[PDB]
Design a protein around this ligand. Structure first.
Ligand code: SAH
Ligand code: NA
Lengths: 265, 265
């Protein structure tokens, strides 16, 4: 009787750790969710085949309201696994599920996996220099979210980089692109006018991290806002003050304008 | 003609991803480095046996000064792997190595794996709330670095959590403990009197992330400064004001005293 939270990784079924695979392979029951993120390089079948077990997919409602009614009961007499994209506890509310397991008398274990949060390192931006992170949510009705704009502002004042997770509506299959995120930010800039996000703002786009050929691009908003970065998922990053080597990488690897080599210390 | 930056993960030889293991097995040459960090839950022999390839270990100088003389030449006419603990390119100097590869006419690909930056999610702290990260270094001679202290001050000033990497003498396999880190911080507090780190400060200690039996402890400095958190490596975190959900996890999963539910929320 035990519950394993197992991350599947960034892009395909092979992004799971060897540890996670060995353990999943020997679990009696296997559950999973695919609404917290998008694994653009695989399918449920490829995952099932790799693990050699049938996988029951749960919706956000199944988890958020019935985790203790669907999964925990089984973990009382067997070994159960709960799979998720990336790392199980990053930019999700899955950590609270460990409390539910406790209160149900079920020991739980976490098997980590590559997360978009650390894969940002491939942009060449020093990961220790990232500050508060934010999520850009699709506007709904007359409710128009803007908190992520202040996050960028606060970080930028401190010279820190900002990681912006992009919205995802799995059931509708809506995956916010870096372009849509850029458009939303420009609209918030007009509203607040704090000189935080403009056509001249340098940004970095990372698409489909985890694949062997992700899209890594850096440039000014005015030039990237209409560029095609391939299929989702995408993340947007607003760098803070750049180090010479960060800029060198952006130019050499992310194709940024050579003029950013000239940093303003 | 191809260089693969492959991550080994967090603790043992099973923390490498399936994608990384298979790709390393198809490589003609395999290098590794264990100066940026160490795999406390395994050995070079076990990693070697798992990959089924002889592994040549490179020192900090081998990499930083002669990467293009030791690794790249072979990468010109072969598939070469460069293994590193955690997720590739997280260590601040590693990204630049891709520029050297390009400059050498060598194609490079990054194969991700779990990093402590994302793994700390198991502490129950929301990942978006982490601010700038720092490293606590051992003082030596007339040198007593304290900038990591200011990092905590600025993060906590904004309700942000601070991730503190602890010093390590990889060569001498000497791990700074969470306890030593706290003593150092108290000392710095005594010298800067900024009211940033005191006996009443709440902290979180994460030891052996990646293991099935990691140590997750949360509490006040005065009660944890002499507690035994087990074998290294240790990671220290100074949380900013907590979200009730975070506090509940620290209490239920990390054994934090109920006092944080009213004092740190
Ligand atoms: N491979 C990938 N490439 C680019 N962005 C990604 C990504 N995987 C996740 N994301 C980003 O993160 C959002 C999901 S947030 C959930 C993240 C997950 N637990 C992890 O550890 O990575 C997506 O909407 C997207 O903006
Ligand atoms: Na961070």
């Amino acid at each position: 009787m035990v519950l394993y939270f197992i991350g599947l990784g960034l892009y395909d079924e092979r992004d799971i750790t060897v540890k996670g695979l060995e353990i999943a392979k020997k679990c009696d029951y296997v559950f999973a969710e695919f609404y917290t993120s998008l694994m653009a390089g695989t399918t449920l079948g490829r995952i099932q085949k790799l693990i050699g077990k049938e996988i029951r997919v749960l919706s956000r409602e199944d988890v958020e309201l019935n985790f203790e009614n669907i999964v925990l009961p089984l973990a009382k007499e067997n070994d159960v696994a709960f799979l998720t994209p990336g790392d199980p506890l990053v930019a999700t509310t899955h950590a609270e599920l460990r409390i539910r397991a406790k209160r149900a008398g079920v020991e739980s274990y976490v098997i980590h996996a590559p997360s978009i949060y650390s894969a940002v390192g491939i942009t060449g931006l020093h990961i220790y220099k990232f500050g508060k992170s934010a999520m850009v949510a699709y506007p709904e009705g007359n409710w128009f979210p803007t908190s992520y704009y202040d996050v960028i502002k606060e970080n930028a004042e401190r010279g820190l980089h900002t990681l912006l997770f992009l919205d995802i509506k799995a059931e509708k299959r809506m995956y916010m692109t870096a372009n849509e995120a850029m458009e939303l930010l420009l609209k918030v800039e007009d509203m607040k006018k704090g000189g935080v996000f403009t056509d001249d703002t340098l940004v970095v786009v990372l698409a489909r991290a985890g694949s062997l050929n992700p899209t890594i691009r850096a440039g000014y908003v005015k030039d990237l806002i209409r560029e095609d970065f391939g299929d989702p998922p995408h993340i947007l990053i607003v760098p803070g003050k750049l180090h010479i080597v960060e800029a060198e990488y952006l130019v050499e690897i992310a194709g940024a304008p050579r003029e950013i080599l000239r940093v303003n210390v």
